[PDB]
């Protein structure tokens, strides 16, 4: 019933090649005979990437879920047959893979990204089990060296999220060591952190916290689709980062080299680097590995937009605790220009209010800590009284009153600090 129809319509489209892929369009529209449409887009390929990759990427990744399920069931049923148009598709896709693999050229990296996300779609929805040659060529394409363009950043992000997504395509120690040497090469690279470094740091935090559930969500968000991963497949992946690749020392040293989220707010949702920095400061990791977080905290506080992110106040609180705990001493914000200049070039009012909140909370922590510190004289390191004269506390809380709804609990906590510490400003 199927082969005769496929041969008849392929002969008809051979007789009329002008409307040949219009019949592929009717195949997609009617959701009948998928292999016929595959043969139609294969037989008429005699610039860009190719038409086949666009066609099946649109099938698997389109808005229409019925077409996606129909093509996925087609590929799933075609896998069970003895090694027929599905194998022609796979051979064409493989020879397309070798057409760009060397690192990659700066113009072929987007083509490689599109092919790689096509393989994502195939192995995620279709249940396609790649061959040994397919897996070897795919992994060779994983470990390429892009020219560190934003296209290259997208390329390495997709490759890394596929290593997380499909850990069943290595199965060999040689591809394992190739993977980890590529990972170390990507880690020691500096221009990638301008992003990909946020993803690397966040998945390192998630394996250290043994989450392995929003790892799936991050992979699904980066690939842009839902895949069943079976996190027991990621069990060997966790031990590679946890014990060998992303140790606590190197993730702590990476935590300061990641750029801050520019103009972060409650509008910028999702799991941000500020959350990972807050989790590390909760565990006192920076003092445990002698890494300076003062510069990163100041740079993150200096760039904030008019809605208040809910993580900023706990981050400031745990940073102050990290300064004043007897475990060690994180360096406070310096008394000069990073505070005086910050409260004079055109810094945001939320930045000024956050710095004022940090200063007043540091004052209360100092006054509630020296009763039981008994550690060192340089451990408190109190701010100068001449500095506080340059801080318009009443003025800043006056602006904070007018933007109460744009701040989460910052105006409230600043009011509490003012009422406890400066009752002469609360008349």
Interface contacts to another protein, rule CB under 8 A: 18-19, 21-22, 25, 41, 48, 51, 53-55, 57-58, 61-63, 106-107, 110-111, 113-114, 117, 149-151, 153-154, 224-225, 401, 404-405, 408-409, 411-413, 415-420, 423, 426-427
DSSP helix/strand/coil, 304: strand
CB of 177 to another protein, least distance (A): 29
CB of 63 to another protein, least distance (A): 5
Q: How far is the CB of 109 from another protein (least distance, A)?
A: 9
By beta-carbon proximity to another protein, the closer residue of 51 and 343 is: 51
Nearest CB to another protein, comparing residues 6 and 113: 113
From residue 183, give the alpha-carbon distance in Å to each of 189, 246, 248. 10, 10, 16
* CB-based contacts of 36, cutoff 8 Å, min separation 6: 5, 6, 9, 10, 23, 27
Q: For residues 67 and 349, which CB has a smaller minimum distance to another protein in the complex?
A: 67
Closest to another protein by CB, 153 or 276: 153
CB of 62 to another protein, least distance (A): 5
Please, is 334 exposed, middle or buried when counting C-beta atoms within 10 Å of its C-beta (0-12, 13-18, 19+)?
exposed
**Which lies closer to another protein via its Cβ, residue 173 or residue 423?**
423
Q: Which is closer to another protein, CB of 15 or CB of 427?
A: 427
Phi, psi of 304 (to 5 degrees): -145, 140
Q: Which residue has the tokens 């520019």?
A: 262
Closer Cβ to another protein, 234 or 255, answer by number: 234
Q: How far apart are CA 166 and CA 419, in angstroms?
A: 56
Min dist CB 325 to another protein, Å, is 19
DSSP line for 267-323: SS-S--HHHHHHHHHHTTHHHHTT---HHHHHHHHHSB-SSPPTTHHHHHHHHHHHH
Q: How many Cβ atoms sit within 10 Å of the Cβ of residue 6?
A: 19
**Helices H, strands E: what count in the chain?**
23, 0
Shortest distance, position 337 Cβ to another protein, whole Å:
30
Q: Minimal distance in Å, beta carbon 9 to another protein?
A: 17
- What is the smallest separation between the CB atom of 377 and another protein, expressed in angstroms? 29
Residue 159 token pair: 């490759």
Tokens of 234: 């990621």
Supply the minimum distance, in Å, between the C-beta of residue 292 and another protein: 30
What is the DSSP-derived secondary structure letter of residue 264? B
The DSSP annotation for 313-375 comes to HHHHHHHHHHHHSSS--PPPPPSSHHHHGGG-----HHHHHHHHHHHHHHHHHHHHHTTS--S
Nearer to another protein, 59 or 339 (CB): 59
Phi/psi at 264 (nearest 5 deg)?
-70, 150
Q: What sections of 130-172 are H helices per DSSP? A: 132-142, 150-165
Rank residues 63 and 372 by Cβ distance to another protein and give the closer one.
Answer: 63
Nearest to 362 by CA among 344, 339, 342: 339
């Amino acid at each position: 019933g199927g082969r005769r129809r496929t041969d008849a319509l392929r002969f008809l489209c051979k007789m009329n090649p002008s409307q040949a892929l219009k019949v592929r369009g009717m195949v997609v529209e009617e959701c009948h005979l998928p292999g016929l449409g595959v043969a139609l887009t294969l037989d008429h390929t005699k610039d860009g990437v190719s038409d086949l990759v666009c066609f099946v990427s649109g099938l698997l990744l389109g808005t229409n879920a019925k077409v996606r399920t129909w093509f996925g069931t087609f590929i799933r049923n075609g896998q069970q047959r003895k090694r027929s148009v599905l194998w022609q598709m796979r051979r064409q896709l493989l020879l397309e893979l070798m057409g760009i693999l060397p690192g990659l050229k700066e113009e072929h990296v987007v083509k490689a990204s599109a092919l790689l996300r096509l393989y994502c779609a195939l192995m995620g929805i279709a249940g396609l089990k790649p061959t040994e040659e397919e897996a070897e060529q795919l992994l060779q394409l994983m470990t390429s060296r892009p020219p560190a363009t934003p296209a290259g950043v997208r390329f390495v992000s997709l490759s890394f999220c596929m290593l997380l997504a499909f850990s069943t395509l290595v199965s060999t120690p040689e591809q394992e060591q190739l993977m980890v040497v590529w990972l170390s090469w990507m880690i020691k690279e500096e221009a990638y952190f301008e992003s990909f470094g946020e993803m690397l740091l966040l998945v390192a935090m998630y394996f250290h916290s043994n989450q392995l559930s929003a790892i799936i969500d991050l992979v699904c968000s980066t690939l842009g689709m839902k895949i069943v991963i079976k996190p027991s497949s990621l069990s060997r992946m966790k031990t590679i980062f946890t014990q060998e690749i992303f140790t606590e020392q190197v993730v702590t040293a990476h935590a300061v080299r990641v750029p801050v989220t520019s103009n972060l707010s409650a509008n910028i949702t999702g799991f941000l680097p500020i959350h990972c920095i807050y989790q590390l400061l909760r565990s006192r990791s920076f003092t445990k590995h002698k890494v300076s977080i003062k510069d990163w905290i100041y740079r993150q506080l200096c760039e904030t937009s008019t809605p208040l992110h809910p993580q900023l106040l706990p981050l400031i609180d745990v940073y102050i605790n990290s300064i004043l705990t007897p475990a060690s001493k994180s360096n406070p914000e310096a008394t000069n220009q990073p505070v005086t200049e910050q409260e004079i070039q055109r810094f945001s009012i939320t930045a000024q209010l956050l710095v004022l909140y940090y200063i007043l909370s540091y004052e209360e922590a100092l006054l509630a800590n020296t009763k039981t510190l008994a550690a060192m004289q340089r451990k408190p390191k109190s701010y100068s009284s001449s500095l506080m004269d340059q801080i318009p506390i009443k003025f800043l809380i006056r602006q904070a009153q007018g933007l109460q709804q744009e701040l989460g609990g910052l105006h409230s906590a600043l009011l509490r600090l003012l009422a406890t510490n400066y009752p002469h400003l609360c008349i």
